[PDB]
């Protein structure tokens, strides 16, 4: 038995830097964001996804993405998520302390 010295290739993770969405609209993170590597194949399935998006209040959300090849080549990248309402709803100053 044996192995060779082949050239692997790190996983190409697949992540948008920033999305922009609104209250009530639908958002789905394994839709978005994809990897794929040479030797080993498909990591999507892989994806660890960190963090959470709300969108019935209005903000920024930001989520992890951490995907490891089996070759032991490990990346990672993150997605900047800001939700806004759809109407207007003014602040009089939220005098809840
Ligand atoms: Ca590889």
Same mark, same amino acid.
């Not at 044996?2 to 050239?7: A, C, D, L, M, P």
């Not at 498909?42 to 019935?56: M, R």
């Given at each position: 038995?044996?192995?060779?010295?082949?050239?692997?290739?790190?996983?190409?993770?697949?992540?948008?830097?920033?999305?922009?969405?609104?209250?009530?609209?639908?958002?789905?993170?394994?839709?978005?964001?994809?990897?794929?590597?040479?030797?080993?194949?498909?990591? #999507?399935?892989?994806? $660890? !996804?960190?963090? /959470? %998006?709300?969108?019935? +209040?209005?903000?920024?959300?930001?989520?992890?993405?951490?995907?490891?090849?089996?070759?032991?080549?490990?990346?990672?990248?993150?997605? #900047?998520?800001?939700? $806004? !309402?759809?109407? /207007? %709803?003014?602040?009089? +100053?939220?005098?809840?302390?």
């Amino acid at each position: 038995m044996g192995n060779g010295e082949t050239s692997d290739l790190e996983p190409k993770l697949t992540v948008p830097v920033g999305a922009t969405i609104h209250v009530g609209d639908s958002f789905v993170p394994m839709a978005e964001v994809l990897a794929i590597d040479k030797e080993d194949g498909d990591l #999507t399935s892989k994806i $660890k !996804v960190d963090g /959470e %998006v709300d969108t019935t +209040k209005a903000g920024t959300y930001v989520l992890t993405y951490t995907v490891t090849d089996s070759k032991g080549h490990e990346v990672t990248a993150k997605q #900047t998520v800001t939700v $806004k !309402v759809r109407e /207007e %709803v003014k602040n009089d +100053k939220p005098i809840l302390e």
